[PDB]
Paper text:
[name]-[name]-2 is an enveloped positive-stranded RNA virus that depends on fusion of viral and target cell membranes to enter a host cell. This first key step of infection is catalyzed by the virus-encoded trimeric spike (S) protein, which is also a major surface antigen and thus an important target for development of diagnostics, vaccines, and therapeutics. The RBD can adopt two distinct conformations: “up” for a receptor-accessible state and “down” for a receptor-inaccessible state. We have previously identified two structural elements, the FPPR (fusion peptide proximal region) and the 630 loop, which appear to modulate the S protein stability as well as the RBD conformation and thus the receptor accessibility. In this study, we have characterized the full-length S proteins from the B.1.1.7 and B.1.351 variants and determined their structures by cryo–electron microscopy (cryo-EM), providing a structural basis for understanding the molecular mechanisms of the enhanced infectivity of B.1.1.7 and the immune evasion of B.1.351.
3D classification identified five distinct classes for the B.1.1.7 S trimer—representing one closed prefusion conformation, three one-RBD-up conformations, and one two-RBD-up conformation—and two different classes for the B.1.351 trimer, representing a closed conformation and a one-RBD-up conformation. The two classes for the B.1.351 S trimer represent the closed prefusion and one-RBD-up states, respectively. In the B.1.351 virus, the S protein largely retains the structure of the G614 trimer with almost identical biochemical stability. Three mutations—K417N, E484K, and N501Y—at the ACE2 binding site do not produce any major structural rearrangements. The most notable differences are in the NTD, which contains three point mutations [L18F(Leu18→Phe), D80A (Asp80→Ala), and D215G (Asp215→Gly)] and a three-residue deletion (L242del, A243del, and L244del). The most consequential changes are probably from the triple-residue deletion, because these nonpolar residues, located on the edge of the NTD core structure formed by four stacking β sheets, are replaced with polar residues His245-Arg246-Ser247. This replacement causes a shift of the nearby loop (residues 144 to 155) and must also reconfigure the adjacent disordered loop (residues 246 to 260), both of which form part of the NTD neutralizing epitopes. The triple-residue deletion rearranges the 172-to-188 segment with a movement up to 17 Å (Leu180). By substantially altering the conformational preferences of this component of the molecular surface, these mutations likely affect binding of any antibody that has part of its footprint in this region. By contrast, the B.1.351 variant completely lost binding to the two RBD-2 antibodies, G32B6 and C12A2, as well as to the two NTD-1 antibodies, C12C9 and C83B6, whereas the affinities for the rest of the antibodies were the same as those of the G614 trimer.
Residue numbers in the entry:
A (entry chain A): 923 to 1162
B (entry chain A): 689 to 728
C (entry chain C): 729 to 1067
D (entry chain C): 1116 to 1162
The structure:
């Protein structure tokens, strides 16, 4: 688990050393603010129907009365160019806010905790996450358990043994085709079916697909070895 | 020998799952995965 | 999950086939590029929203031909071969119950001149330079992603979200669910025929409800109506004078000399350019709401379909067992199953 | 039962506790062993 983690942190380091486009989420947020400002500077070149775009050229080539008629155009056009920029920036700010509230929620639920939410803290079952800073953003390195090498087994919802029906306390029943075991749900580690591994409810007539196998009682060989102890002690007490 | 192709996009590789009323698959092993996620 | 992608040709809307008007429109600078860019940004985002909501699997899961799901009858929500697109029974109700104003699929003119032109308004939008663009994922590919999510859910539990699809019998998946809501798994097996008959009956109530009332899909129909009303309003503004002598660009040019015509034309340019900047601002604000709805739908796809949720009232009313996605026009329907 | 429950502390500290028996499944499993042992000891008086 340590070697797989250390190797996966190595793959992140090499991936970030190799491709450009992965940080496009942040670079696009820098590019949009830069493009919006480049556009707002370019609008200072528009005439808006005045005789010139250059404010000093209007004011130097015309007297007060017809100059107000030319300048009012440049004011009206430029003012709409600011209101367009500010409306666009309020709509982007509303997006960045939503992304920041998502990032605050992932900081709280993936870094300060562990999440049961599927695919929220990366793909796989969430173990933990590590935050990293980036220009205008946060990178989360999510660490996740992915189940990797499956085998098929035959399974049953229940075991019938002593006429009564048995169910796993935690995990699931499996068979290799010859013997039966409990195992935990998310990793194959088989164990003998026992009165500690299983709980009992009702008789085996009602459960669809129930199977016959023995359920072992771990107390039975404690008492039966204590019976062979008692039997040899009674047999010995015939001798003196 | 290179050009613009055009095609119907694939959604993903097809993978029918080996279901039965009595068959289960259980993982004998795991891989710790680290994945980067990037937020503005 | 999405809304109709729209491109508006700013020069053709403001200055339709007049170079006199086009040379005046150039004096307003980069505004038509800002408008084209903003609507392109929305249109790209409608595919992203649809990818985030539906494309949560890299593998396309196919259901077995035998339907031994422990008595649970998914035949209303799985695909049927009898229809030339792989939609479920319930999805073919959803695609009928929302009226879809312009899908964008080729206006060949034989459909858009003559008798139909006297009754169809979409051709007037198109002729004024307003065009609806098709989604990247058509209703067949959305039906296949939804089929794969549902096939994965009924065949493999939650595991296809975590990693490989691991088969499990459906009655054992439902037991793992029951343990998830704190009900002991013997309660499923001792009642399995009842739990199956109730699920089958509840899917029956969904089918009959969707067959009966209109208003339930208003969540999707009013997103179509808002985009349709916004474009009808944008077409209507070509009737406004804005204080010019005429609403009609050719009429102004038919009667006035160069020096006097420009004072009338630049009124229409100024009023129509406001009429676009209102439409594009309104569509960006709509796009910001549909985005939030697509992020919510992607979060419900991840937490209600690819999993089981402990979050109260997030995946339906009641304690969450599982949920089945179904495709709809511009949307997703979740069938949440709850104890 | 002792499988269905866990013990901590005495009965004085818990507000609203009730008296009832809690069954130990090991007790009658050993009590049939006491009756087995009793009949075996008494049978060993007969030969
Ligand atoms: C299903 O799981 C069973 C339990 O793991 C397994 O049975 C076990 O098989 C091993 C041999 O592979 C036996 O080990 C003994 O084998 C010989 C017996 O003479 C000895 O030389 C060895 O030292 C060792 O004691 C286990 O005893 C046996 N367990 C039982 C209860 O029979 C099955 O083989 C598995 N079946 C399949 C199809 O995989
Ligand atoms: C699982 O193990 C069970 C116990 O060994 C076994 O139950 C036994 O099944 C037989 C056949 O059904 C019953 O035999 C009786 O059948 C009818 C009356 O119901 C009569 O015609 C017969 O003469 C006979 O009385 C046994 O009574 C029954 N035992 C018990 C304790 O119920 C199951 O059949 C096994 N099932 C599998 C799938 O392995
Ligand atoms: C569970 O999956 C593990 C992989 O994530 C796997 O570990 C890998 O095991 C093999 C041997 O079985 C190792 O192979 C290398 O072994 C040495 C170098 O150490 C060389 O001589 C070989 O040629 C070969 O390169 C892998 O290095 C090893 N990987 C890791 C990260 O330890 C486990 O074996 C799997 N466990 C089970 C029970 O299946
Ligand atoms: C799973 O649920 C399905 C929906 O209830 C069900 O399909 C329905 O089956 C009935 C019975 O065949 C059909 O009723 C018609 O059946 C024949 C047709 O020739 C006539 O004799 C009857 O009068 C009646 O018209 C339903 O129409 C049919 N519904 C659909 C949408 O196909 C499946 O049979 C169920 N499968 C299982 C395994 O439970
Ligand atoms: C738990 O709630 C169940 C309802 O969700 C309830 O199931 C219903 O039980 C009644 C009988 O008690 C059945 O009534 C019908 O029975 C036959 C037709 O099959 C007719 O002769 C009757 O007139 C009547 O129509 C219902 O069909 C049945 N509903 C379902 C979905 O199976 C259980 O009885 C309740 N269980 C407990 C332990 O309270
Ligand atoms: C549940 O059962 C308990 C025992 O079966 C019982 O406790 C008993 O309570 C009485 C009265 O409080 C005690 O009697 C003693 O009272 C004082 C000393 O505290 C003396 O005057 C008496 O002579 C006598 O010693 C018992 O000693 C006490 N025994 C035990 C084992 O607790 C609880 O009261 C019962 N609970 C309820 C709610 O009734
Ligand atoms: C798990 O089982 C499936 C299919 O069931 C098995 O099919 C036989 C091969 C035999 O093992 C039966 O007793 C089982 O019922 C396996 O899926 C097959 O995989 C091969 C490639 O290995 C492929 O060519 C087949 O088309 C698949 N068949 C089906 C029905 O899907 C699967 O390989 C098994 N998993 C593992 C990890 O072994
Ligand atoms: C499983 O399906 C087979 C038919 O393919 C059937 O014979 C068997 O009885 C079924 N078992 C259960 C528990 O459904
Ligand atoms: C039998 O009991 C006597 C007690 O006097 C003891 O000496 C002897 O070792 C016992 N034998 C066995 C086999 O226990
Ligand atoms: C519960 O309330 C009643 C009065 O309504 C009181 O007599 C009783 O002692 C209370 N029991 C507990 C456990 O608080
Ligand atoms: C008593 O013990 C003897 C063996 O010493 C045996 O033959 C007899 O059947 C026993 N009786 C009982 C009731 O156990």
């Amino acid at each position: 688990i340590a070697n797989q983690f250390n190797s996966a942190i190595g793959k992140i380091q090499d991936s970030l050393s190799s491709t450009a486009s992965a940080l496009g989420k942040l670079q696009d947020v820098v590019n949009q603010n830069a493009q919006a400002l480049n556009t707002l500077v370019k609008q200072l070149s528009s005439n808006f129907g005045a005789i010139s775009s250059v404010l000093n050229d209007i004011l130097s080539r015309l007297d007060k009365v017809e100059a107000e008629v030319q300048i009012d155009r440049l004011i009206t056009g430029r003012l709409q160019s600011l209101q367009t920029y500010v409306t666009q920036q309020l709509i982007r700010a509303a997006e960045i806010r939503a992304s920041a509230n998502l990032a605050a929620t992932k900081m709280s639920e993936c870094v300060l905790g562990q999440s049961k939410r599927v695919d929220f803290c990366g793909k796989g079952y969430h173990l933990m996450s590590f935050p990293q800073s980036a220009p205008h953003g946060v990178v989360f390195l999510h660490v996740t358990y992915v189940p990797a090498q499956e085998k098929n087994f035959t399974t049953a919802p229940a075991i019938c043994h002593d006429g009564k029906a048995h169910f796993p306390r935690e995990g699931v029943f499996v068979s290799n085709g010859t013997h039966w075991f409990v195992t935990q749900r998310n990793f194959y580690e088989p164990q003998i079916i026992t009165t500690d591994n299983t709980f009992v409810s009702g008789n085996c007539d009602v459960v669809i697909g129930i199977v016959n196998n023995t359920v072992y009682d771990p107390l039975q060989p404690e008492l039966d070895s204590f019976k062979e102890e008692l039997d040899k002690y009674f047999k010995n007490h015939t001798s003196p | 020998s290179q050009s613009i192709i055009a095609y119907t996009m694939s959604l993903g590789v097809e993978n029918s799952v080996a279901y039965s009323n009595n068959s289960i698959a259980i993982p004998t092993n795991f891989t710790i995965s680290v994945t980067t996620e990037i937020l503005p | 999950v999405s809304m109709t992608k729209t491109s508006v040709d700013c020069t053709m809307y403001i200055c339709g086939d007049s170079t006199e008007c086009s040379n005046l429109l150039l004096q307003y600078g980069s505004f038509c590029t800002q408008l084209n860019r903003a609507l392109t940004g929305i249109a790209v985002e409608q595919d992203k929203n649809t990818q985030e909501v539906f494309a949560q699997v890299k593998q396309i899961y196919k259901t077995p031909p035998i339907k031994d799901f422990g008595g649970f009858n998914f035949s209303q929500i799985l695909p049927d071969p009898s229809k030339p697109s792989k939609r479920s029974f319930i999805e073919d109700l959803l695609f009928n119950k929302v009226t879809l104003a312009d899908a964008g699929f080729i206006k060949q003119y034989g459909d858009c001149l003559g008798d139909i032109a006297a009754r169809d308004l979409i051709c007037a939008q198109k002729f004024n330079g307003l065009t609806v663009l098709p989604p990247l994922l058509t209703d067949e590919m959305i039906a296949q992603y939804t089929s794969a999510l549902l096939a994965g859910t009924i065949t493999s539990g939650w595991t296809f979200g975590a990693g490989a699809a691991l088969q499990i019998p459906f009655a054992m998946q439902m037991a793992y669910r029951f343990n998830g809501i704190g009900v002991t798994q013997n309660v499923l097996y001792e009642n399995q025929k009842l739990i199956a008959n109730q699920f089958n009956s509840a899917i029956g109530k969904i089918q009959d409800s969707l067959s009966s009332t209109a208003s339930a899909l208003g969540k999707l129909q009013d997103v179509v109506n808002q985009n349709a009303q916004a474009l009808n309003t944008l077409v209507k503004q070509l009737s406004s004078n804005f204080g010019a002598i005429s609403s009609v660009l050719n009429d102004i040019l038919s009667r006035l000399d160069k020096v006097e015509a420009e004072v009338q034309i630049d009124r229409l340019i100024t009023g129509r350019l406001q009429s676009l900047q209102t439409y594009v601002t309104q569509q960006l604000i709509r796009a910001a709401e549909i985005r939030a709805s697509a992020n919510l739908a992607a979060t419900k796809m991840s937490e209600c379909v690819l999993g089981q949720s402990k979050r109260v009232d997030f995946c339906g009313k009641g304690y969450h067992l599982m949920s089945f996605p179904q495709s709809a026009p511009h949307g997703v329907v979740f069938l949440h199953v709850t104890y």
